[PDB]
């Protein structure tokens, strides 16, 4: 469960990210595709060329969902309900890949938040991203 301290940490860190969220979402996707090439098996329909607008657009969608999850941190199952339906019934990404994207999101945050990415904030962000992932895979079967 996300503690009050976790929620404070996540809200502060994502607040600092602010309007950079979409850019960071794209960067996290690019990091994931390069670092964990098996994740590209979910995007054979994408243009994956360097600086791909399609990847950037996707990064924005991922980031905006995360922004929403932060805004609704007390009730993520409800806030993410439509998205979790889509993941379970259409996208059907194997659960292991959520940990890969989550790690790449942490790396991206670490690379952009030198002051903010303390050990405690790192821990809270990791819990938050794992919780989002749990919600997104909750209806798989």
């Amino acid at each position: 469960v996300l503690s009050p301290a976790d929620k404070t940490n996540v809200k502060a860190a994502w607040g600092k990210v602010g309007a950079h969220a979409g850019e960071y979402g794209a960067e996290a996707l690019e990091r994931m595709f390069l670092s964990f090439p098996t994740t590209k098996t979910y995007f054979p329909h994408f243009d994956l060329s360097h600086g791909s607008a399609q990847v950037k657009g996707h990064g924005k969608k991922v980031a905006d969902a995360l922004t929403n999850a932060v805004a609704h941190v007390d009730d993520m199952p409800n806030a993410l309900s439509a998205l979790s339906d889509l993941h379970a019934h259409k996208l059907r990404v194997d659960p292991v890949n959520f940990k890969l994207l989550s790690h790449c999101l942490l790396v991206t945050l670490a690379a952009h938040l030198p002051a903010e990415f303390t050990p405690a904030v790192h821990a809270s962000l990791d819990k938050f991203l794992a919780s989002v992932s749990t919600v997104l895979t909750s209806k798989y079967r």
Binding site: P37, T38, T39, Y42, A88, R92, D94, V96, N97, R141
Partner: protein, 146 residues
């Protein structure tokens, strides 16, 4: 992944009794029932709407034959699984776009199917040998991803 001589013997002994066609269909069917998101790769196979629709689906069963045929062939080359599965690895990456995590899932489902068919004969040591095999096959099928 290195089997002992006795493990190799046990794997080969058990496999001689396997109906590889039947077992392949059953393993692939159970994959699609137990982990239904894996149906994403088989939309063309028709009705996958219930456990029976999946298990008895003739296209699932026919495909399971291919899969287990290739697995059966790999059992003859336990010391060179990466080489054995290289062209299939490239195919599953470049043409089929299959996340290799699926190979790990299928291997464990296959182990369950072997236990179901063989009962007490699928002893803990025999299982341990087969776990080395399915881990090696999954790792081999993943190896040429890029």
């Amino acid at each position: 992944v290195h089997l002992t001589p006795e493990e190799k013997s046990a794997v080969t002994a058990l496999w001689g009794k396997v109906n590889v066609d039947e077992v392949g269909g059953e393993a692939l069917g159970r994959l699609l029932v137990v982990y239904p998101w894996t149906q994403r790769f088989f939309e063309s196979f028709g009705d996958l709407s219930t456990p029976d629709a999946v298990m008895g689906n003739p296209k699932v069963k026919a495909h399971g034959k291919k899969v287990l045929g290739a697995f059966s062939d790999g059992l003859a080359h336990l010391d060179n699984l990466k080489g054995t599965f290289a062209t299939l690895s490239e195919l599953h990456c470049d043409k089929l776009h299959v996340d290799p995590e699926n190979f790990r899932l299928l291997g464990n489902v296959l182990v369950c199917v072997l236990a179901h068919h063989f009962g007490k004969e699928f002893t803990p040591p025999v299982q341990a040998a087969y776990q080395k095999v399915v881990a090696g096959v999954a790792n081999a099928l993943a190896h040429k991803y890029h």
